[PDB]
TrEMBL record:
<feature type="binding site">
    <location>
        <position position="49"/>
    </location>
    <ligand>
        <name>Mn(2+)</name>
    </ligand>
</feature>
<feature type="binding site">
    <location>
        <position position="51"/>
    </location>
    <ligand>
        <name>Mn(2+)</name>
    </ligand>
</feature>
<protein>
    <recommendedName>
        <fullName>Replication-associated protein</fullName>
    </recommendedName>
</protein>
<comment type="similarity">
    <text>Belongs to the nanoviruses/circoviruses replication-associated protein family.</text>
</comment>
<feature type="domain" description="CRESS-DNA virus Rep endonuclease">
    <location>
        <begin position="3"/>
        <end position="101"/>
    </location>
</feature>
<comment type="subunit">
    <text>Interacts with the capsid protein; this interaction relocates Rep into the nucleus.</text>
</comment>
<feature type="binding site">
    <location>
        <position position="41"/>
    </location>
    <ligand>
        <name>Mn(2+)</name>
    </ligand>
</feature>
DNA sequence: TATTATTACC
């Protein structure tokens, strides 16, 4: 993963499988996260997807985070604030939330 | 980065 290692990440999982949901539920806990929010969403195409943000307690490299989330996620370092992500990932009103946004 | 996709924060 080179030096691409962060605590704060965005992720998307398109067409989540049952196993994707299990990995996300098992990982998005206070053990691992200061704050996490994951919304179940559909865009204009109607493709169901998980829309997620993680503020992790420890740095993760992409390969490790990929494994933790089930292996099918698009990942990138977060550029907005925790609150920006809390609003964005809650916008379709079917979501899981762990912890509180960190300023 | 790793990865499935038009979804992806600022
Ligand atoms: Ca970080
Ligand atoms: Ca499955
Ligand atoms: Mn979305």
């Amino acid at each position: 993963s080179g030096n691409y290692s962060y605590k704060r990440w965005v992720f998307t999982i398109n067409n989540p499988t049952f196993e994707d949901y299990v990995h996300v539920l098992e990982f998005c806990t206070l053990d691992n996260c200061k704050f996490a929010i994951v919304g179940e969403e559909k865009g204009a195409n109607g493709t169901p997807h998980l829309q997620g943000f993680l503020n992790l307690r420890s740095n993760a490299r992409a390969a490790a985070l990929e494994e933790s989330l089930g292996g099918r996620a698009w990942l990138s370092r977060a550029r907005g604030s925790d609150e920006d992500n809390e609003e964005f990932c809650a916008k379709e009103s079917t979501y899981l939330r762990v912890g509180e946004p960190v300023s």
